[PDB]
Design a protein around this ligand. Structure first.
Ligand SMILES: COC1=C(OC)C(=O)C(C/C=C(\C)CC/C=C(\C)CC/C=C(\C)CC/C=C(\C)CC/C=C(\C)CC/C=C(\C)CC/C=C(\C)CCC=C(C)C)=C(C)C1=O
Ligand code: SF4
Ligand code: SF4
Ligand code: SF4
Ligand code: SF4
Ligand code: SF4
Ligand code: SF4
Ligand code: FES
Ligand SMILES: [Ca+2]
Lengths: 588, 120, 905, 198
């Protein structure tokens, strides 16, 4: 049985446990290509099912994802409960190394679900986004307000009857929103943001945005301060919302790849990898080994690029300015190799459904050798010049620390979760793209996720990525760069240029689009900043019926108030520098 | 050959063209315009081109004073040579007859046999 | 019947084959040579499935699903590995000789062969040898020919010969050199040859008129519209790109015109793209012209009309029900006049009275094919109502269908049905002034003057029932042929009587009504069909109004000083000199029209009306069915200076500016409600389509496909800033991709057929309840009137025999499919198809006047002499002269008229 | 040719006043202080241009300001989201004369690939732009090229020397388009390197 085959996962022990606890008629198991068991739960049993999953012997500890779905235009709903809308809950058991996707069906007029925030606190922002984009009410939510769109927005953009395209620009609305911006500083009400005790006559209120002079993006945080101590902080996000999921419903499976590039814009091919893997699951494509090695090498090069940017930006946030110049020189070496291979620097859009766009150019190994000889001396110099400086250690050590429980309850992934001591990397736990054929280590922390611990873990991850690149350079299969599947999009170019069957396939694939049979697919990867996942629903057409992107920066930004309360503002800047987020990843 | 595959493959939709035909039957673009203020330089049009006509070249210096001047018509795009693919000719492959290539003169094509031929 | 496909149980019709049953169930089986309208022949071998003997069978056998009945307890597998391998191999065999042509082939993106190549999953070529090639033929102005792309599926010859009755297409040659085409270069002679471009699954036969301004299907903007070129009401999908009407595709209507158009509807759209069309309101000051915007035109026209003493209106059967009603509201009902002549109006109201008071059911166009005897009286159906002639051909083949059904032969096995019914056919009796295109299948053809055709009809009615009035002076040979017709019609289980207003005689319509009444009185299931002239002739007849001659007398006596003329070239319905005099005398002439007509030089105001591509409205076909057509594109999108509004919008805004001095344009549903409130006989046009608030789960219906390209570059030469999307407050369609076109959407109006994996016209399979049946939620359009409980009385006014008169030449009409409909003559591609105007003479009359074939003769009509060259017509009886109606200078009102001083030039 | 703002006019430009206006323009064009404003990925390539491997400091345009009062050039490098558009407008209004605008990338130019419900289709919907850079992202040397184009535009413009003496109108040179200027050399290109090699 291939790894992309449709499965019901009835042999998962959690299905038997749910059978024993709630009975056999309490839920409906759906066969998908997501790789996880998908269970349709009644709305009135959702909290009991969630608590039961949380109290298992090897429990489901993390709410990985929570979002909605407009099911009104879905023609192929065979074996599914009747639903105008639905809400899905992706939960991860680390100890079992397993997931489960709960789905609640909803009628068009009865669009309310009990809140999940008492079980998992990251459900706050997830349910705010579900209410914002789908209009689904969550009963019991502390502050159910719009998080992506402005508060005075009409409609819900991810509904199927909402038009995707930009409306006609009016300067009157711009001047009205400017007046809103200049009056908000005078008419601030600290109850509509979920805040309490709105002036003790000592709480000073500051704003950090909505413009930030940094590479992670521009965003606003409202700070409630007692002297220099943060007693409350609520973020304002959605300032970089690009409608990427709605655009996923508008582009074909092939033409959406450049949009996947710009989710986490320091990631590139790393961002492309989960999307093309999920589409290949929908298409039933098993890529050859050379494709796996090529995609792994590109992803590791972009991971080194992103980590160099993160370490240099953290050092600049501490107060040392020269390592960012040197790290950008190293980024230029990486960009030389990436430009040679893909023809682009930052958004290569080079991965394809079933492979990559072109073969590797002649002489790529010389550039890889030059980079692999250039990097380690520079990394050691960076450590000795900035990372071992006691001023940086005093700025970083002990600042915004959390343990394993706080990381699990907020959906924290990546270097923060591993800095809490939990050894969970996607490339080892749920291997993808031939990562099992590479010998590399996963660095973990001692149990405390500090700013310094996260930065040093990212340094060791950079060294491990250099090891993976060395193994990629020494071991390359001499095979195809595209799979021989009929749904490989586009087909190989020379056969397109001289064979009529291949020309026909290319013609229909680039114009109407490749036809993906109706299914649901899922793929999570270890991105540069945590776990990035694509959840794709095909209704049998040439475009996605639903593209859901889970990004780790959303979860880390939601974890910000739990870890920074009672600290200084300078500690908040250091924490923002040590998270490794970008606002495009947050808002999508 | 104004086949319009690059325009539909463009995710931004910044390619517009119209097919015209010569006297001998050769397809060509009557016009061809690319809005470079919209273009994201993703290369999907070059990938989709079945004739290797449209190509992305190593030239980054495209800065402009007026945004209307970033609309490049056919006179601003058509160059004097083959570019990155020096030998490919789609019309040597196509069965459609043009000037200088009658029926049966394309690659891997036999001469036409008329139905009134005496051979069985 | 119970079938089991891939382990799933299904209930199907046992009289269907497996391919049509499985395609009706939503399953995907590739196919080439089968068509729903043509039956099964088993040529292409693409539709192979694996049939098992029973449930406990594992080997199976590959069968063709199109040639295998969907009998009870059938067991088949589509996704069997051997069946999939064989279907891929069939695609591969078709691909060995296929040219490398998709970029320069007009079928690309709309190609059934491309779709089935992708559907079978065949994308790797291992064939390395040479490809066979073919020379192409010239097939005329409409169809381009490219035989390299042929897959030898035989669909073209089966449709053209077996279905459409054409004779100049065929298959030639042998084994892999099979060639599909004509015996030599020449124009395809069939009136229904244009359906080849959708019948052919490859790019062999292509729309040449589209090919001149080619664009791909995904780049089109479509709308569900009605063909304007005659009264049949065939549903069409006009598709546009860059502001110009690019193509007319067939839009499936299971009740009207299911898969097929005629060539007039398909290729006679080119008048919309004419450069001399009015784009904006123009007002003449002295000898100069000034261009106004819509507000200034409304203010000035309202002021001048308010100053006038009496405003009269002249509608048109071209224009929709809403626009004619808006004219009738603006000028008043008593001051409203129909734009057609007095005799034309009398024949039209008599046809309407027979249709909605004759007590005899009038069948739809699809229902015509089930009648087992046809009598056509006077109406040259092929040249005036061509799709009715196609349906009558199918009804004639009904006899072979009956004899095959007697021998327990399945209704889809078309070759066996044709073999059993060799040349036996249901009786067709056509009457005309000359030979018709239906004569090759007609049991009898009566070439006689229109009064003699009426006398034949009255004699048939009297021989069917003695209460009908008798005809005295019938020759014994004509009496024997009348007895043949009467014996054929009396023994028929379902006789059909077809007539129309094109014959130009009231007594022909009365004779048809008397035959229908006589057949009704004997308990037969008789149907009656009337053929009107133009797209909304029946709507203008239902609305009513005075004739054009009454309006001309009003404008000539001077008691009417302002005239509004809507969508009307007045020279078609009246003499040109009288019209020019009455319009030069009138101090105010306002013309609302979308074409540069000849009365726009004497027009003081000209309003740029929209054509059917740029307007919404309702038209009534000759069956009595109200059908809504929708706007295709916004004319102001590319050229913002274009002020081209709906005619009812113009006239409603004029009435509002006249009354309240304020400019309110309107909404379409308000005009619909106004029509159904003032006119109760047009109350059915409310239900023809849902209103503009109709939604499919909250979203509108899309006009363009999902992959519509160039949205940030198609106007970038004008300005790099993208304009706003056009807003459609009139209908439920949106002018964008942001809409719904799902095949399962609960609607009846479908702008275009597309499904994932089905990019060709075969996606109409997905848009149907069963393949070849109706649309899934019903065909659009509703009948205005039901069958009356009581019929009429026998018309006792039997006309006398035609006597020739010396110096008096009775004009016999000779209609043409290419040339007798005004807007289609305006299309530039119809000039190549335009026959040279020849005046038809009897050999005896031409010998008496001493003129041979090809000589120019001059005749005087309305005090004006015109010269036409002579063609000898044997069938035209003496005392008649044959003229081509509707041509340049020969109005259709001349049919049935006399002529004076026909002399050799 | 020139464009007047306070109209297409001619060149208004004594021989000392012209030389000293040229010295004013030279000082303005050789001292350009960009504003620090991070919108999206285009800003990452902009700060890549600021780094050592490119060294845009050579042109004197490295002085990055967190205050719009001390910044002469606004580089809109990123998508103009609907929530960020009033912020961009306020930051532009906070700048002082003379102020110049460079749109960097397809998002700032036209909206780019995001013709979506939450994105303003180009920053020139509400803010005047002097130099546009196509690309997604433009490479750092393209940003430097746009900087040189801005210097050529600045060196050919006429601004009020003082607010109390002389004409107070702002004159902007209607320069030739770069497309028509480079059409001579771009069309003459015949052969490029094949993509198989490096
Ligand atoms: C993003 O990183 C940064 C830069 O880019 C390298 C800067 O240039 C800068 C600006 C600082 C400098 C160029 C060094 C200090 C010298 C400056 C500003 C020269 C100013 C001189 C005068 C006013 C004299 C007249 C900052 C603050 C920065 O953080
Ligand atoms: S490179 Fe530019 S023109 Fe070509 S497909 Fe991409 S966005 Fe469109
Ligand atoms: S550039 Fe290529 S893809 Fe585009 S229309 Fe021309 S031949 Fe077709
Ligand atoms: S007929 Fe179809 S497969 Fe053949 S060249 Fe044309 S588009 Fe391609
Ligand atoms: S010309 Fe077309 S319809 Fe006729 S046999 Fe060939 S492919 Fe079939
Ligand atoms: S029969 Fe009449 S309505 Fe139908 S396509 Fe022909 S002209 Fe149009
Ligand atoms: S133009 Fe491209 S690189 Fe620049 S901000 Fe937009 S998505 Fe990012
Ligand atoms: S469709 Fe059945 S053999 Fe052709
Ligand atoms: Ca309209």
């Amino acid at each position: 049985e291939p790894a992309w085959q449709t499965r019901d996962h009835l042999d998962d022990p959690v299905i038997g446990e749910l059978r024993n606890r709630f009975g056999p008629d309490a839920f409906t198991v759906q066969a998908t290509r997501t790789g996880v068991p998908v269970v349709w739960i009644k709305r009135e049993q959702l909290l009991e099912v969630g608590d039961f999953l949380k109290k298992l012997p090897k429990p489901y500890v993390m709410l990985f994802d929570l979002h909605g779905m407009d099911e009104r235009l879905r023609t192929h709903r065979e074996g599914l409960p009747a639903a105008d809308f639905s809400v899905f809950y992706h939960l991860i058991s680390i100890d079992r190394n397993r997931d489960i996707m709960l789905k609640v069906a909803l009628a068009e007029n009865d669009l309310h679900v009990p809140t999940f925030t008492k079980l998992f606190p990251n459900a706050n922002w997830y349910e705010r986004e579900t209410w914002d984009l789908f209009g689904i009410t969550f009963d019991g939510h502390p502050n159910l307000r719009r998080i992506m769109m402005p508060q005075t927005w009409k409609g819900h953009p991810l509904r199927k009857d909402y038009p995707a395209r930009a409306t006609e620009f009016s300067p009157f609305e711009l001047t009205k929103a400017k007046q809103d911006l200049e009056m908000e500083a005078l008419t601030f009400k600290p109850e509509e943001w979920g805040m309490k005790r709105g002036t003790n006559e000592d709480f000073m209120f500051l704003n950090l945005g909505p413009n930030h002079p940094s590479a992670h993006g521009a965003f606003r945080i409202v700070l409630q301060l007692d002297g220099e101590e943060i007693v409350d902080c609520v973020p304002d996000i959605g300032y970089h919302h690009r409608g990427a999921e709605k655009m996923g419903e508008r582009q074909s499976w092939h033409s959406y790849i450049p949009y996947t590039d710009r989710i986490e814009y320091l990631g590139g091919c790393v961002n492309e990898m989960p999307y093309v893997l999920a589409v290949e699951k929908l298409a039933g494509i098993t890529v050859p080994d050379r494709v796996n090695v090529i995609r792994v090498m590109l992803s590791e090069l972009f991971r080194i690029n992103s980590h160099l940017l993160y370490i240099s930006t953290f050092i600049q946030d501490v107060g040392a300015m020269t390592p960012v110049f040197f790290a950008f020189t190293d980024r230029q070496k990486i960009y030389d190799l990436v430009e040679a291979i893909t023809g682009f620097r930052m958004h290569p859009a080079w991965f394809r459904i079933g492979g990559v766009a072109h073969d590797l150019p002649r002489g790529w190994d010389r550039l890889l050798r030059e980079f692999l000889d250039w990097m380690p001396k520079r990394l050691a110099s960076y450590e000795k010049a900035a990372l071992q400086n006691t001023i940086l250690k005093g700025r970083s050590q002990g600042v915004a620390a959390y343990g394993a429980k706080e990381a699990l309850e907020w959906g924290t992934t990546g270097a923060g979760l591993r800095a809490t001591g939990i050894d969970f990397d996607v490339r080892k736990a749920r291997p993808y793209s031939g990562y099992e054929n590479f010998d590399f280590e996963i660095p973990v922390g001692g149990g405390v996720s500090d700013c310094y611990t996260r930065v040093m873990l990212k340094v060791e991850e950079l060294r491990q990525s250099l090891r993976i690149l060395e193994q990629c350079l020494n071991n390359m299969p001499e095979g195809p760069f595209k799979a021989d599947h009929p749904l490989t999009t586009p087909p190989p170019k020379e056969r397109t240029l001289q064979h009529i069957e291949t020309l026909i396939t290319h013609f229909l694939q680039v114009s109407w689009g490749p036809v993906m049979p109706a299914n649901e697919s899922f793929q999570m990867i270890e991105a540069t900043k945590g776990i990035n996942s694509y959840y794709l629903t095909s209704d049998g057409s040439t475009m996605s019926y639903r593209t859901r992107i889970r990004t780790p920066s959303y979860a880390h930004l939601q974890q910000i108030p739990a870890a920074i309360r009672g600290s200084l503002v300078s500690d908040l800047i250091v924490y923002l520098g040590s998270i490794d987020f970008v606002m495009s990843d947050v808002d999508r | 050959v104004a086949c319009n595959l690059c325009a539909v493959a463009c995710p931004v939709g910044c390619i517009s063209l119209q097919k015209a035909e010569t006297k001998d039957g050769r397809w060509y673009p009557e016009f061809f315009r690319i809005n470079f203020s919209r273009c994201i330089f993703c290369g999907l049009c070059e990938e989709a081109c079945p004739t290797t006509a449209i190509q992305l070249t190593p030239d980054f210096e495209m800065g402009e004073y007026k945004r209307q001047d970033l609309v490049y018509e056919k006179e601003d795009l058509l160059i004097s040579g083959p570019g990155k693919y020096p030998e490919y000719n789609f019309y040597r492959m196509a069965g459609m007859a043009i000037d200088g290539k009658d029926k049966g003169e394309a690659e891997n094509e036999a001469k036409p046999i008329d139905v009134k031929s005496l051979l069985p | 019947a119970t079938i089991h496909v891939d382990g799933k149980e299904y209930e199907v019709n046992g009289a269907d084959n497996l391919l049509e049953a499985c395609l009706s169930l939503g399953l995907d089986i590739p196919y080439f040579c089968w068509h729903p309208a043509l039956g099964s022949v088993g040529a292409c071998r693409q539709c192979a499935v694996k049939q098992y003997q029973n449930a406990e069978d594992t080997r199976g056998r590959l069968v063709m699903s199109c040639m295998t009945p969907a009998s009870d307890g059938t067991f088949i597998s589509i996704d069997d590995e051997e069946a999939k391998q064989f279907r891929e191999s069939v695609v591969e065999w078709l691909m060995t000789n296929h040219p490398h042509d998709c970029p320069v082939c007009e079928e690309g993106g709309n190609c059934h062969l491309q779709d089935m190549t992708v559907m079978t999953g065949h994308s790797f070529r291992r064939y390395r040898f040479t490809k066979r090639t073919h020379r192409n033929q010239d097939l005329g102005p409409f169809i381009s020919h490219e035989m390299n792309r042929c897959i030898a599926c035989y669909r073209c010859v089966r449709y053209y010969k077996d279905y459409a009755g054409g004779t100049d297409l065929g298959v030639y040659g042998a084994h892999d050199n099979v060639y599909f085409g004509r015996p030599e270069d020449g124009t395809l002679e069939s009136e229904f040859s244009g359906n080849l471009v959708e019948i052919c699954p490859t790019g062999v036969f292509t729309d040449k008129t589209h090919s001149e301004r080619y664009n791909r299907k995904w780049d089109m903007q479509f709308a569900p519209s009605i063909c304007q070129q005659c009264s049949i009401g065939c549903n069409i999908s006009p598709g546009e790109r860059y502001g110009e009407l690019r193509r007319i595709e067939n839009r499936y209507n299971g009740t009207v015109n299911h898969y097929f158009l005629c060539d007039r509807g398909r290729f006679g759209y080119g008048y919309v793209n004419l450069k001399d069309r009015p784009r904006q309101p123009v007002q003449r000051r002295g000898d100069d012209f000034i261009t106004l915007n819509a507000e200034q035109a409304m203010q000035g026209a309202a002021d001048i009309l308010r100053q006038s003493k009496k405003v009269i209106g002249i509608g048109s059967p071209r224009a929709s029900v809403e626009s004619n009603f808006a004219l009738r509201e603006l000028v008043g009902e008593e001051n409203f006049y129909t734009g057609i002549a007095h005799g034309e109006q009398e024949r039209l109201q008599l046809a309407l009275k027979v249709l909605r008071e004759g007590g005899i059911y009038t069948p739809a166009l699809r229902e015509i094919e089930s009648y087992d005897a046809v009598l056509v009286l006077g109406e040259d159906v092929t040249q005036t109502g061509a799709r009715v002639a196609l349906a009558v051909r199918q009804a004639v083949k009904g006899k072979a269908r009956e004899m095959a059904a007697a021998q327990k032969v399945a209704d889809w096995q078309i070759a066996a049905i044709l073999n059993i019914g060799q040349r036996a056919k249901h009786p067709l009796f056509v009457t005309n002034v000359d030979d018709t295109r239906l004569d090759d299948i007609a049991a009898w053809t009566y070439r006689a003057p229109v009064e003699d055709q009426a006398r034949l009809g009255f004699a048939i009615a009297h021989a069917l029932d003695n209460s009908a009035p008798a005809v005295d002076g019938i020759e014994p040979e004509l009496q024997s042929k009348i007895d043949v017709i009467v014996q054929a019609l009396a023994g028929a289980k379902k006789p059909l009587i077809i007539s129309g207003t094109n014959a130009g005689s009231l007594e022909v319509i009365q004779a048809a009504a008397n035959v229908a009444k006589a057949l009704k009185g004997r308990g037969a299931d008789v149907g009656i069909t009337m053929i009107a002239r133009s797209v909304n002739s029946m709507g203008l007849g239902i609305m009513g109004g005075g004739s054009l001659e009454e309006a001309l007398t009003e404008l000539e006596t001077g008691r009417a000083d302002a005239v509004v003329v809507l969508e009307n070239d007045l020279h078609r319905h009246a003499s040109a000199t009288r019209v020019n005099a009455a319009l030069a005398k009138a101090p105010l002439v306002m013309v609302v029209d979308h074409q540069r007509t000849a009365i726009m030089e004497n027009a003081h105001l000209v309003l740029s009306a929209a054509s059917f591509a740029e307007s919404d409205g309702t038209v009534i076909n000759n069956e009595g069915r109200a059908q809504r057509f929708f706007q295709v594109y916004d004319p102001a999108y590319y050229d913002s200076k274009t002020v081209m509004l709906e005619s009812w919008r113009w006239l409603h805004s004029l009435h509002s500016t006249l009354l309240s001095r304020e400019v309110d344009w309107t909404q379409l549903d308000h005009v619909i409600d106004a029509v159904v409130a003032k006119i109760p006989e047009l109350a059915g046009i409310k239900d023809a389509a849902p209103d503009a608030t109709f939604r499919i789960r909250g979203q509108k219906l899309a006009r363009e496909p999902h992959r519509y390209s160039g949205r940030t570059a198609m106007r970038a030469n004008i300005s790099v800033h993208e304009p706003r999307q056009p807003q459609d407050i009139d209908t439920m369609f949106t002018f964008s991709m942001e809409g719904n076109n799902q095949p399962t959407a609960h609607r009846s109006q479908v702008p275009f057929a597309w499904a994932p994996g089905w990019n060709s016209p075969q996606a109409w399979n997905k848009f149907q309840d069963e393949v070849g049946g109706k649309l899934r939620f019903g065909d659009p359009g509703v009948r205005l009137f039901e069958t009356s409980e009581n019929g009429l009385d026998y018309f006792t006014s039997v006309p006398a025999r035609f006597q020739p008169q010396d110096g008096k030449w009775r004009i016999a009409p000779y209609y043409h499919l290419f040339g007798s409909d005004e807007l289609s003559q305006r299309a530039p591609v119809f000039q190549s198809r335009m026959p040279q105007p020849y005046i038809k003479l009897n050999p005896a009359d031409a010998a008496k006047l001493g003129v041979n074939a090809g000589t120019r003769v001059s005749f005087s009509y309305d005090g004006n002499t015109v010269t036409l060259p002579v063609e000898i017509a044997e069938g035209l009886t003496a005392g008649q002269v044959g003229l081509p109606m509707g041509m340049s200078g020969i109005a259709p009102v001349l049919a049935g008229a006399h002529l004076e001083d026909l002399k050799e030039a | 040719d020139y464009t007047l703002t306070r109209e297409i006019v001619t060149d208004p430009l004594n021989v000392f006043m012209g030389k000293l206006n040229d010295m004013v323009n030279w000082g303005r064009k050789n001292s350009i202080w960009p504003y620090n404003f991070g919108l999206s990925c285009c800003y990452v390539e902009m700060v890549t241009s600021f780094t050592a491997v490119h060294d845009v400091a050579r042109f004197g345009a490295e002085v990055l300001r967190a205050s719009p009062r001390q910044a002469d050039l606004m580089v809109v490098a990123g998508t103009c989201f609907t929530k960020m558009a009033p912020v961009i407008q306020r930051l532009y209004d906070q700048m002082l004369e003379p102020k110049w605008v460079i749109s960097m990338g397809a998002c700032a130019n036209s909206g780019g690939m995001y013709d979506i419900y939450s994105v303003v289709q180009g920053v020139d919907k509400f803010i005047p732009v002097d130099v546009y850079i196509p690309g997604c992202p433009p490479r750092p040397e393209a940003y430097m090229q746009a900087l040189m184009l801005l210097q050529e535009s600045i060196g050919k413009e006429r601004r009020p020397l003082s607010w109390v003496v002389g004409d107070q109108g702002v004159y902007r040179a209607n320069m030739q388009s770069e497309r028509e200027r480079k059409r001579g050399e771009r069309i003459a290109v015949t052969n490029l390197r094949t993509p198989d090699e490096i």
